[PDB]
Design an enzyme around this catalytic site. Structure first.
Site, PDB file in Angstrom:
ATOM      1  N   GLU A   1       0.783  -1.225   0.000  1.00  0.00           N
ATOM      2  CA  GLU A   1       0.000   0.000   0.000  1.00  0.00           C
ATOM      3  C   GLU A   1       0.814   1.273   0.000  1.00  0.00           C
ATOM      4  O   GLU A   1       0.302   2.310  -0.379  1.00  0.00           O
ATOM      5  CB  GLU A   1      -0.901   0.008   1.244  1.00  0.00           C
ATOM      6  CG  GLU A   1      -1.900  -1.132   1.209  1.00  0.00           C
ATOM      7  CD  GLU A   1      -3.033  -0.971   0.218  1.00  0.00           C
ATOM      8  OE1 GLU A   1      -3.041   0.162  -0.424  1.00  0.00           O
ATOM      9  OE2 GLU A   1      -3.862  -1.822   0.053  1.00  0.00           O
TER      10      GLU A   1
ATOM     11  N   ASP B   1      -6.694   6.501  -4.772  1.00  0.00           N
ATOM     12  CA  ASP B   1      -6.168   5.176  -4.942  1.00  0.00           C
ATOM     13  C   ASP B   1      -6.220   4.743  -6.401  1.00  0.00           C
ATOM     14  O   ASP B   1      -6.600   5.548  -7.236  1.00  0.00           O
ATOM     15  CB  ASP B   1      -6.749   4.146  -3.959  1.00  0.00           C
ATOM     16  CG  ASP B   1      -8.181   3.762  -4.220  1.00  0.00           C
ATOM     17  OD1 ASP B   1      -8.711   4.378  -5.212  1.00  0.00           O
ATOM     18  OD2 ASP B   1      -8.799   2.983  -3.540  1.00  0.00           O
TER      19      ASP B   1
END
Ligand SMILES: [Cl-]
Ligand SMILES: [Cl-]
EC number: 3.2.1.17
Length: 162
Positions: free
Chosen positions: A11, A20
Site C-alpha cells: 500500500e 487510490d
C-alpha cells in the site's frame, strides 16, 4: 516478514489525502476515506477518523494508528464471515496473511465472492487456486500486487516480498 510489513509494502505510506488505483480518496497506509467524488467529503471523513481538524494532512503516528485499526478489523471481519472463516482456519500462517491482504484491499464482500478459489484453497490445491485467482478483475487491474499475493498462496512462503 509479517502482515504489517507485507501490507506496508503493497500500500505504501502517504501523509496527504490521495487517490487510490480506483480513483478513491485515501490517506496513510491504504486507508480508504470515501468513494465519494468530493474532497470535502473526504476531508470530513478524515477529521472524524482522526479526531481533529487535519486539513487533509496527518502524521506518521496517526497513519500507523489507522493502519493498526484496519488490520484488526480485517482479521475480525474474516472471523465473523461464514464464507471466509472456514478458509482462514484451514490455512498456515503465511497463507492467512495472504487472505488478510486481499480482505484489506477489497473488503470482506469482495473476497467472499471468490467462492471457487476459496474452495480450492481449503482443499490445498495451490496451483489450481493460483490459476483461478488470476481470472479476476482484481488480477487485471492490479497485476503486480495480485501476483505477489498469488505467489504467497501458491508457495506458502514470503519469497514474493523478499
Ligand atoms: Cl475509521
Ligand atoms: Cl499492481
Amino acid at each position: 516478514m509479517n502482515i504489517f510489513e507485507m501490507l506496508r509494502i503493497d500500500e505504501g505510506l502517504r501523509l496527504k489525502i490521495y487517490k487510490d488505483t480506483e480513483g478513491y480518496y485515501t490517506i496513510g497506509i491504504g486507508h480508504l476515506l470515501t468513494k465519494s467524488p468530493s474532497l470535502n467529503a473526504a476531508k470530513s471523513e478524515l477529521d472524524k477518523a482522526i479526531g481533529r481538524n487535519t486539513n487533509g494532512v496527518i502524521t506518521k503516528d496517526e497513519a500507523e494508528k489507522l493502519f493498526n485499526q484496519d488490520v484488526d478489523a480485517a482479521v475480525r471481519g474474516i472471523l465473523r464471515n461464514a464464507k471466509l472463516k472456514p478458509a482462514y482456519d484451514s490455512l498456515d500462517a503465511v497463507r492467512r496473511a495472504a487472505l488478510i491482504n486481499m480482505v484489506f484491499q477489497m473488503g470482506e464482500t469482495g473476497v467472499a465472492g471468490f467462492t471457487n478459489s476459496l474452495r480450492m484453497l481449503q482443499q490445498k490445491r495451490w496451483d489450481e487456486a493460483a490459476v483461478n485467482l488470476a481470472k479476476s478483475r482484481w488480477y487485471n487491474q492490479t497485476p503486480n500486487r495480485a501476483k505477489r499475493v498469488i505467489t504467497t498462496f501458491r508457495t506458502g512462503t514470503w519469497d514474493a516480498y523478499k
